[PDB]
């Protein structure tokens, strides 16, 4: 058995039965008793190995929920989850990444392995790939059950590659997708995209320069436009053909230096990189945005050919992105440290016709995106990471994060971490009610601490604590103890909702008993990530 | 100052001919590694019995909630990719190496499909950074093999 207490659900206990009926597949059936509810939840986990790959199913079911029947009057609870991944022979890339719940609130209510109170939707995916060295083709379905929704149904992605066509290497990417909405009144599309690409890779010992050209060609057939076009001043068109050249140059050098002044026989490296990108302006305000979110610009992200993550927005470009990295290697040529800093200079506004974003500044030209990374492998037990993103259009640091970590062993570690995102960045990049609602508008300014240590030969103690520096309140805290042979005991407090008229957070508190440091460090929201 | 242009290749000259081995030769990592080796000018051989073999091993990817809003709902995911690999040099030792890449993005429950396109595009970039990270371990394997 296993047992629990929580502020959400009072006393709980579990009576797991394990069922073995084949050498390659098995099941766990567990009647999950609860005290705040009147009924047993039945949870049913199934595991299999197959020629098609390895996968996991879960089916959780309440015949009736007394709390839901009182809290949603005048109206069962269940979760189904499936995950599969494989490559059959060496060519058939089969995958499933699917979950479905009866209602939005299931993850505020029930602790489970396969979703979180932290989630804004349940994802629902299937795909079949065929892949070989020169060619791949993938058929996929992308659906989302939103809790607070467009689907791709189906999507086809195809790639072909052909090297050595003279001095050039070449590829073509093509896609066909049908977009459907959960609402009967939203636009529909079928989109066809074609992207032939040619590049000339030149290199030697001290540097390289890659010159690349694409044609971006997209066809839209759009339907169900009447509800949108009767409400908006700029109209969607029933057919749209978008055709755009892209040109890119990506030059690099490497310099080195004797680091003997720091330590015996150490090596320093300096790597300036300077990329030019051009894409002409095409108005896309007559194309509805089904899949293109604005992208986050970390230091490696300074070198993209995309400002948005999909195909419905493709920003004009006439820009130089300029960076520099330097590295230190020790006498054994192991990398001890690196720092990278770079920026994007725009000679013309990065416009997309549907220029929907809100900025603190009215200028659009000159040096205005900056980013940097650093890493230091201080020793084989200590390591430090940092990142910063700055945007002159926000007049602020847009995002930052840092961590420092000590590990002696899988059981003996301490980590500190920090994450920041500005109020102006949340305003610019997220749904326009996030700029106003008190739980969202204040950015992020989160401090985290994590530790594990054996307190005696057989006894491990684990804990975590996350704090919001703007709220002056904890986001999560966790404590865990185990005795090995084995028994394990845990505690958690987490944010688990909000109270709307009172404008304060709801906290779930829980205590658990079971009959392991890494399993405990994984168990909370905000779970432990090894940063060495 | 004291800076000089790098006067030797980024891949050590005992590894400008190499064998590439994987349990998934057609997948995204093997394609990114093969691209990064070929871009450096490595002559890659079929699975010359005296040539060193780079064997790609277990790969894992996770997305975790890195951050939360004041209602306890995700702000940022962090994605972490771990790649194990090993270089077998014939008539010498086996040299295990790895890469570890960290990327972040904000969620959006409106435009969930767009954030799934952003996630697939970021995982594509992470295989290129994991490939770059593995190639920078090849100079240390030359130094370690001479010191063996």
Author numbering:
A (entry chain A): 231 to 305, 309 to 381, 387 to 723, 727 to 756, 768 to 784
B (entry chain B): 19 to 65, 69 to 169
Text lifted from the article:
Lipopolysaccharide (LPS) assembly at the surfaces-exposed leaflet of the bacterial outer membrane (OM) is mediated by the OM LPS translocon. An essential transmembrane β-barrel protein, LptD, and a cognate lipoprotein, LptE, translocate LPS selectively into the OM external leaflet via a poorly understood mechanism. Here, we characterize two additional translocon subunits, the lipoproteins LptM and LptY (formerly YedD). Whereas LptY binds and stabilizes the periplasmic LptD β-taco domain that functions as LPS receptor, LptM intercalates the lateral gate of the β-barrel domain, promoting its opening and access by LPS.
As baits, we used respectively LptMHis expressed in wild-type cells or LptEHis expressed in ΔlptM cells. Notably, both eluates contained an additional protein migrating at an apparent molecular mass of approximately 15 kDa. Using cryo-EM and single particle analysis, we determined the structures of the purified OM LPS translocon complexes in n-dodecyl-β-D-maltopyranoside (DDM) micelles. The structure of the core complex, LptDE, was solved at an overall resolution of 2.74 Å for the transmembrane portion including the LptD β-barrel and LptE. The membrane portion of the core translocon was superimposable with that of the holo-complex, resulting in an RMSD lower than 0.1 Å for the largest portion of LptE and the LptD β-barrel domain.
